[PDB]
Amino acid sequence: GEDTVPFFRGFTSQPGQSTEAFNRMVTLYDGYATSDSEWDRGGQSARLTDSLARSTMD
Amino acid sequence: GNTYVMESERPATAESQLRDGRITVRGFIRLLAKSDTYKARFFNPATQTR
Amino acid sequence: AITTQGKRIYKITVSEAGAYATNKHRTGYRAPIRQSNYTLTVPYDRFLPEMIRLHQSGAKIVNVTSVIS
Amino acid sequence: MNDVFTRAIAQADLKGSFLLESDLDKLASFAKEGVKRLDAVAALTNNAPAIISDAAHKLFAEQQELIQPGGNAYPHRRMAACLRDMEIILRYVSYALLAGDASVLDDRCLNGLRETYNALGTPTQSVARAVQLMKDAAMVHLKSTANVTVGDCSSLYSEAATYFDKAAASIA
Amino acid sequence: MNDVFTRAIAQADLKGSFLLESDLDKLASFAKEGVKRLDAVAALTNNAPAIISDAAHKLFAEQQELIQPGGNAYPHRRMAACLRDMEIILRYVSYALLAGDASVLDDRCLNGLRETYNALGTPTQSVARAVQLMKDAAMVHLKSTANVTVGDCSSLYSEAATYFDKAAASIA
Amino acid sequence: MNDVFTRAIAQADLKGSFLLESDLDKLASFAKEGVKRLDAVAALTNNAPAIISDAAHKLFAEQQELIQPGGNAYPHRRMAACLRDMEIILRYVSYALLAGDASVLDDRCLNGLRETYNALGTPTQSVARAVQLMKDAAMVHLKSTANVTVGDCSSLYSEAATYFDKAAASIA
Amino acid sequence: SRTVITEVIATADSQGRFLNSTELQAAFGRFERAVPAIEAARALTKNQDALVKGAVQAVFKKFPYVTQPGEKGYGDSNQAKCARDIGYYLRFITYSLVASGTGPLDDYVIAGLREVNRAFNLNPLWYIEALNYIKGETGKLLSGQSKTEALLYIDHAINALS
Amino acid sequence: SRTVITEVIATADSQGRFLNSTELQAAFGRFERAVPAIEAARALTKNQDALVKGAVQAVFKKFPYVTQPGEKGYGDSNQAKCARDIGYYLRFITYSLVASGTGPLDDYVIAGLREVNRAFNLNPLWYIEALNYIKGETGKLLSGQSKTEALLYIDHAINALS
Amino acid sequence: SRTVITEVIATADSQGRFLNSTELQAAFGRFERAVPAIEAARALTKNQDALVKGAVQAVFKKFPYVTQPGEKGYGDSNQAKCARDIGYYLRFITYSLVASGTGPLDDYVIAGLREVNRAFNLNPLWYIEALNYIKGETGKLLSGQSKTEALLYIDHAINALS
Amino acid sequence: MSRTVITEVIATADSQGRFLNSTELQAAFGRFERAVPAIEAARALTKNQDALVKGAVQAVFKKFPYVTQPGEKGYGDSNQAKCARDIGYYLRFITYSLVASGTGPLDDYVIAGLREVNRAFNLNPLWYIEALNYIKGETGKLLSGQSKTEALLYIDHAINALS
Amino acid sequence: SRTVITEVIATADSQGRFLNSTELQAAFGRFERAVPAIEAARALTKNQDALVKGAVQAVFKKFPYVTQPGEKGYGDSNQAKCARDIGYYLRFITYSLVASGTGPLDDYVIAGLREVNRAFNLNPLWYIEALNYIKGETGKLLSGQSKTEALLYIDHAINALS
Ligand SMILES: CCC1=C(C)/C(=C/C2=NC(=C\c3[nH]c(/C=C4/NC(=O)[C@H](C)[C@H]4CC)c(C)c3CCC(=O)O)/C(CCC(=O)O)=C2C)NC1=O
Ligand SMILES: CCC1=C(C)/C(=C/C2=NC(=C\c3[nH]c(/C=C4\NC(=O)[C@H](C)[C@H]4CC)c(C)c3CCC(=O)O)/C(CCC(=O)O)=C2C)NC1=O
Ligand SMILES: CCC1=C(C)/C(=C/C2=NC(=C\c3[nH]c(/C=C4\NC(=O)[C@H](C)[C@H]4CC)c(C)c3CCC(=O)O)/C(CCC(=O)O)=C2C)NC1=O
Ligand SMILES: CCC1=C(C)/C(=C/C2=NC(=C\c3[nH]c(/C=C4\NC(=O)[C@H](C)[C@H]4CC)c(C)c3CCC(=O)O)/C(CCC(=O)O)=C2C)NC1=O
Ligand SMILES: CCC1=C(C)/C(=C/C2=NC(=C\c3[nH]c(/C=C4\NC(=O)[C@H](C)[C@H]4CC)c(C)c3CCC(=O)O)/C(CCC(=O)O)=C2C)NC1=O
Ligand SMILES: CCC1=C(C)/C(=C/C2=NC(=C\c3[nH]c(/C=C4\NC(=O)[C@H](C)[C@H]4CC)c(C)c3CCC(=O)O)/C(CCC(=O)O)=C2C)NC1=O
Ligand SMILES: CCC1=C(C)/C(=C/C2=NC(=C\c3[nH]c(/C=C4\NC(=O)[C@H](C)[C@H]4CC)c(C)c3CCC(=O)O)/C(CCC(=O)O)=C2C)NC1=O
Ligand SMILES: CCC1=C(C)/C(=C/C2=NC(=C\c3[nH]c(/C=C4\NC(=O)[C@H](C)[C@H]4CC)c(C)c3CCC(=O)O)/C(CCC(=O)O)=C2C)NC1=O
Ligand SMILES: CCC1=C(C)/C(=C/C2=NC(=C\c3[nH]c(/C=C4\NC(=O)[C@H](C)[C@H]4CC)c(C)c3CCC(=O)O)/C(CCC(=O)O)=C2C)NC1=O
Ligand SMILES: CCC1=C(C)/C(=C/C2=NC(=C\c3[nH]c(/C=C4\NC(=O)[C@H](C)[C@H]4CC)c(C)c3CCC(=O)O)/C(CCC(=O)O)=C2C)NC1=O
Ligand SMILES: CCC1=C(C)/C(=C/C2=NC(=C\c3[nH]c(/C=C4\NC(=O)[C@H](C)[C@H]4CC)c(C)c3CCC(=O)O)/C(CCC(=O)O)=C2C)NC1=O
């Protein structure tokens, strides 16, 4: 909505959402503490790309 | 992404305008995305896919 | 945006016409019901998408005024 | 935002009883002639680049004040918006043609476009002239009978003329 | 959007001086008698759905036209809107009642609702006497001493009546 | 938002002629005096916090009721808004000064402020006095030539005078 | 009012391009669907009163326990309004049959159904059983296509009630 | 301003729903805490003048190097404004007690406090110590609950100062 | 039309803050660059008609398939439009030199180019070769800072056209 | 990820959190009934691809012969081999989209990124426009009835993408 | 950090576009302005200890009560910390001069200043006084271009403090 603060709707099935989004954002959240600055090196490498690779094929 | 937003970084004008309400919260989110520090945190050190 | 075209923001006054209310009811009230009449500030750059999305929402424009010139 | 069949159903609803036999027959005839109108609108969509090219070239031929310095279509973006406005207007006209109802056309931006152009300062009769030029190019491209057998199209052109005149009146 | 407490403090800040003793005394009178008003609003909230249902029954009994085709509530979703609207108006009555000030109802609802309903074309007098039906059912359930200590609430009844009256008058 | 060179380009384009050699000469005169103007804007920017502090201090000196109860800025939020609005007015006029033209100030700053102040009941004359106090402190601080080369600044004096004068006129 | 052509229009106008092959072909397909549905709706409009009344008595027969003092339908006025309710839904069945879409149904009755039923304490299963009665007759009254899309529409109606 | 019932009503309208238990219990909480705040307001009503005066002298005392000529403390209008300031703050404190919430205090003094504090060289710790003095006399003027919530409200005023 | 000053002020407004070392330095650096670009623009203006005719004949020579009758390049009205277009292009190059930024060229021509050209069937190679002749003639027109500025702006115009 | 009738049906039904209503089932039936003429068109165009590609080569040569001139990008044996291979690819993909009864194969395969190819390689669509025009001229007799207009639709969609 | 070349790179990257004439002009301007800035850097390099001691003793003059026992300035280790802080400030000012901007200064002091100021009660007025003394003495140490740009860096830091 125009007046709602965005939140993490992951871990929650969205209308017509892929089964992969749950797994990816589980792998990507990892708690409150996970910061995505230029440090911790986790906000730099694309963790999701390996999983996304499987989506195009079957 | 749970990065601490340091106090000097914030635009007082944008938050004041949202306080008046000429913009929705969505407009303030847009303006915040246009902030340089946002790119500095994410666009600047990370690959475009990441 | 910085260009002479990008400036000249245009105010938009929006009314929730009956079509918009019928659309919003059947899509579902996932957002709070806000009053029918509301003015919105839209620059030249995103001028078209505003009433585009409002038209797909079923709403209709009251009037449009230009902030700059 | 209702279709022609939805229009008839809406009247049947408001009068509170079932639809009448003549309404049923006219809607059946509309279903039969839907083949014709879908042919016409598909040709329109195919010929749409040709229609817009012809109409715009005739338009910029018949007047030059848009292209001269300071013109309403001079900065090479305003005339781009001109092209976009013609194509979207004819898109709406085709929408009304296939839907069989002008109420959806009026709801789609016709309630706002007149004051939009008034605020922009755009000459509205120029827009009407461009719409009529597209209407002419459209009827010309529709009279094209390539790779297709012949059938009744006069009523289709009547409906197209009514829609185009409605658009011209609504804009200006 | 204020209550008696906030509005009184507002006047105190207006004069710039401190609260008067008598002001604080009226405040204490409100506070100690507050739990009465709380029990009233709680009973209202609990009995709400039955109030809506039976007032709707009276609504349909005393007029048939809305049930007939073309009624402002004739479509299923338009009557659903009718019901949710009595719901929300009595809800705002409950709010202003708990706050003890009409201003919270005024600013939060009336300014937009007036134009909304006038545009919708629903008969304002009809909605007002529907508010009267709401008032009647609510007074029935408010007179109810169901499982509560007995006492005096005449002033509360009067002010609930006044809130219903202001809602009906503004909505008229 | 634009600057004077942009206006020259826009007028030349809308006529479709080029910028005349006299126009090029006056633009180059601005350019060589542009160094002068940048020093003026730097004097504004460095002294802007002190300018605003002193101007607000004196503003409260002549106007006591405003921070007294009943004043438009008596609550801390409202006088805070006073401070930051005077800040932003000075910042936008500084934008106009370094631009060498005024419409950059009007397009975003002086576009919607007056109607908001009329609706809110803000005393706009007090705001005009604040802006001319910005003038006073800007003259006090920009006349300081210590730690910078000496020269003529009557052009900058007149130009900043125009910007503050038109800001006060638009606001009030 | 989302008849198939209506969402065709919505998909077309949502983005910038004209109508491609798929929506034209779907519009054609609907335009041959129009006929058997039209005879189905006409046949049902011919058989109005007997069918609606029989549906009402079927509701009595499969739900006898309410028929006692305890029906919201108990009393001549309430039974008559049961009949008029069934008539309204028959109206909407015919309208959606003509419209080649759930348009009338989802626009009017399916829109905001469950909360209205909760407010008025009207068990949908009664309506569902009435439409199963309608299933029983329409198995004979209509044949082939007309039968098939009529059955599918009233299936969607059942699902809407559920 | 806002009292507890103001957040109550704002939330209830935010979800667009009727008030359940918890906010009604908050309504209680406010009602039974009203009386102690009531005599707190009584006391602060009676005592104001000496409170303001003592705040002036105490802030001049533990900050000696501000009193002398050549800085903020010197100049008669300066301490006149100090007195008016303290009167305003403790009046808003009385408002807080009456409202049983930060509402009036917050929206009247707390908003924009910092930028004013460095926008006029007015050191906040001046006001923290003024409110510390006010704690000093209220530790004796009031008693029991009235004392407790008055302490809490002046503490929040200090906390926003700090 | 955009000037270094214009982007500077727009970014400052977006951040809502005064101009620092970087913005003042950019302002300066654009200011000394103003005079040689002005000289370049004037030297291009004085050679306007010769440049237009030279571009016309250069486009005539480069593509053999443009001049013959029945083609889009052929035409007295077509060639009048050619000369008008070339005058527009070089005048807007001078405008960008005036602003000391590409913004004038950018918005005035570059915005809305490709879709317009494809809607009207305009070969971008035509404008590429025309501005290539402009490059060849302007290289001998100017030397030093003016030459560098003019060549950069015409190169950017070609890159947009290419 | 190709867009076709049934695939976009599945995507749309997944989108709204709903099952398949009357409209999607009827559209599926229409796709089944319309596939057979598309099958006939695809098979018939598969039979005579040699003549179509060779005639297209000569036709695009006739339209703008100057590209075949020496010193131009069109002159050269490798250029001719590439022309033949490209036009073969076009007819392959057009038959593909005829089979799928949707532009999605063409969309993804060619219409995705074709424009930058033309700009980066100076291959003005006009030659491929002439190629597809020749294809339509020849297929104006190859097919019949429904299959005729079916092939015409997709080839003209490719034209509009090129234009 | 943020130096003119770095903003140029990041901005060009934003719109996904190569560099243009304007940003190369800005880089050029940085290149010539570096030489006076480098000279200023040398001047501040060889005067560091005098800078520090003079600033600390100026703070003494304006704020001697700070050195009183029970306050911050009291304590030899406290004063070592004062001098170390001022030296850090001056080193970051040197980085700013060599950077043709305020990038490293912002990144390494301005990010998080007022927070620590509140934390250890570090009054920014102290550092305003220290940098004002540094400004006054650089009025003698430097002259002309280097003087003016170093002054702008120092007073930008001052205004950030204020
Ligand atoms: C779940 C939270 C909760 C509630 C709501 C509650 C009910 C409640 N309502 C009260 C006030 C009251 N309110 C009323 C009025 C009532 N009597 C009639 O006259 C009216 C129909 C009706 C008004 C709606 C009365 C009689 C009291 C008791 C005051 C007294 O006589 O001392 C009191 C104070 C009486 C006492 O404790 O000695 C209680 C306990 N108790 C709780 O723990
Ligand atoms: C939701 C609860 C929460 C957690 C779990 C949390 C940990 C946390 N520590 C962070 C950075 C930091 N955290 C510390 C603190 C540690 N490092 C030093 O060794 C200190 C001795 C020590 C403190 C005891 C420091 C110094 C940084 C800055 C490091 C950097 O990013 O450069 C960040 C990055 C935030 C940002 O800048 O956007 C997080 C999220 N923060 C939270 O809000
Ligand atoms: C786009 C950037 C931007 C601008 C330009 C801006 C100006 C601005 N000033 C406003 C009202 C106001 N303007 C003032 C100031 C005036 N009243 C008196 O105090 C003074 C004499 C005088 C100042 C010299 C005040 C006090 C208010 C709000 C009244 C209140 O706080 O209740 C408002 C409406 C509500 C608000 O946010 O305060 C805006 C939007 N705000 C922004 O975010
Ligand atoms: C999905 C897109 C589409 C396709 C594939 C299509 C082909 C098509 N259109 C048909 C009907 C037809 N279509 C037309 C077309 C008219 N003739 C006039 O000259 C006008 C140029 C034109 C516009 C009205 C005619 C005359 C018929 C046969 C008469 C009838 O409608 O039954 C038929 C049946 C005739 C037969 O097979 O023998 C086919 C196969 N039409 C389409 O819309
Ligand atoms: C919902 C559908 C929709 C419509 C109908 C619409 C009309 C429309 N046309 C506009 C600009 C424009 N439109 C035109 C076209 C007109 N002037 C020419 O001379 C022609 C005769 C004529 C074309 C028929 C022009 C020249 C402009 C530029 C006006 C300006 O830059 O100030 C604008 C302002 C923003 C923009 O597009 O840049 C709108 C809102 N916008 C929409 O989103
Ligand atoms: C901000 C708080 C709020 C208010 C003030 C409110 C009233 C309200 N009623 C509305 C529509 C409506 N309201 C009604 C009810 C009226 N017509 C008849 O049925 C009755 C006699 C009468 C009710 C007693 C109807 C039927 C509509 C739909 C109008 C239509 O479909 O044309 C609308 C427009 C969109 C909507 O919410 O449905 C509002 C805002 N709703 C809110 O959430
Ligand atoms: C197209 C829109 C439409 C709908 C959705 C509709 C159903 C409907 N049923 C209603 C109540 C009712 N509905 C019924 C009929 C039901 N109760 C019995 O158990 C039967 C098993 C069953 C019949 C299948 C009865 C008896 C009432 C009266 C209950 C009351 O008034 O509270 C009402 C309230 C208005 C009135 O009193 O007439 C409606 C609108 N009628 C419509 O025109
Ligand atoms: C309802 C909102 C509101 C508040 C909060 C308020 C208090 C208040 N007093 C002020 C001035 C002042 N405040 C003080 C008091 C401080 N200086 C020292 O003397 C004392 C130790 C210390 C007191 C604890 C002084 C001396 C001034 C005058 C500043 C000057 O000399 O210019 C100011 C700043 C305006 C100015 O500088 O003239 C405010 C906001 N007034 C209001 O309308
Ligand atoms: C000020 C902004 C502006 C620009 C940039 C501009 C270029 C331009 N020239 C046009 C016409 C034309 N332009 C040309 C010239 C080109 N074709 C070849 O002959 C030459 C190699 C080449 C010139 C160097 C021709 C021949 C036409 C004829 C109409 C056509 O068929 O497109 C058109 C289409 C509408 C018209 O003017 O009639 C545009 C947009 N017009 C503008 O208002
Ligand atoms: C990024 C480089 C950096 C800087 C710039 C920095 C400033 C700094 N100085 C500090 C201590 C201090 N800073 C001062 C200086 C002030 N106090 C007053 O007495 C003087 C008037 C005034 C000097 C002008 C003093 C006395 C202390 C010791 C007491 C304390 O604040 O904890 C502290 C608290 C931690 C500590 O040093 O023990 C910081 C963070 N720290 C850093 O790591
Ligand atoms: C980005 C770095 C930069 C800065 C900071 C800068 C300021 C500046 N302006 C200059 C010219 C000047 N600037 C001024 C303006 C000042 N003198 C007047 O008295 C006023 C107090 C004030 C204007 C309001 C004057 C008078 C001159 C010398 C005459 C002239 O303009 O040619 C000079 C040349 C003198 C020298 O090198 O010592 C500098 C350095 N130039 C730069 O490239």
Author numbering:
A (entry chain 5): 691 to 748
B (entry chain 5): 592 to 641
C (entry chain m): 10 to 78
D (entry chain h), E (entry chain g), F (entry chain i): 1 to 172
G (entry chain a), H (entry chain e), I (entry chain c), K (entry chain d): 2 to 163
J (entry chain b): 1 to 163
What does the primary publication say about this deposited structure?
Phycobilisomes (PBS) are antenna megacomplexes that transfer energy to photosystems II and I in thylakoids. Here we show the cryo-EM structure at a global resolution of 2.9 Å of the 5.9-MDa PBS from Anthocerotibacter panamensis (hereafter A. panamensis), a recently discovered Gloeobacterial species that diverged from Gloeobacter spp. around 1.4 billion years ago. The two-fold symmetric PBS contains twelve APC hexamers assembled as a heptacylindrical core surrounded by twelve PC hexamers, with approximate dimensions of 273 Å (width), 500 Å (height), and 129 Å (thickness).
In addition, a chain-core linker CpcN (LHC) was found connecting five PC hexamers into the top two PC chains. In contrast to the tightly stacked rod cylinders in hemidiscoidal PBS assembled by CpcC, PC hexamers linked by CpcN form loosely staggered disks attaching on the side like a chain. The attachment of CpcD to each pfam00427 domain of CpcN likely inhibits the formation of rod cylinders because CpcD acts as a rod-capping linker that terminates rod elongation in hemidiscoidal PBS. Although negative-staining EM and two-dimensional (2D) averages from cryo-EM indicated that the four distal PC hexamers in the top two chains (Rt4/Rt4’ and Rt5/Rt5’) exist, these four PC hexamers are too dynamic to reveal a defined density map for reliable atomic model building. In contrast, the staggered-packed PC chains only exhibit a preferable inner-chain EET pathway with a longer bilin distance from Rt2’ to Rt1’ (37.0 Å), compared to 24.3 Å in a rod. In the PC chain, two transition dipoles exhibit a tilt, with a κ2 value of 0.41. This finding suggests that the efficiency of EET between donor and acceptor bilins in the PC chain is lower compared to PC rods, even when accounting for both the distances and orientations between them.
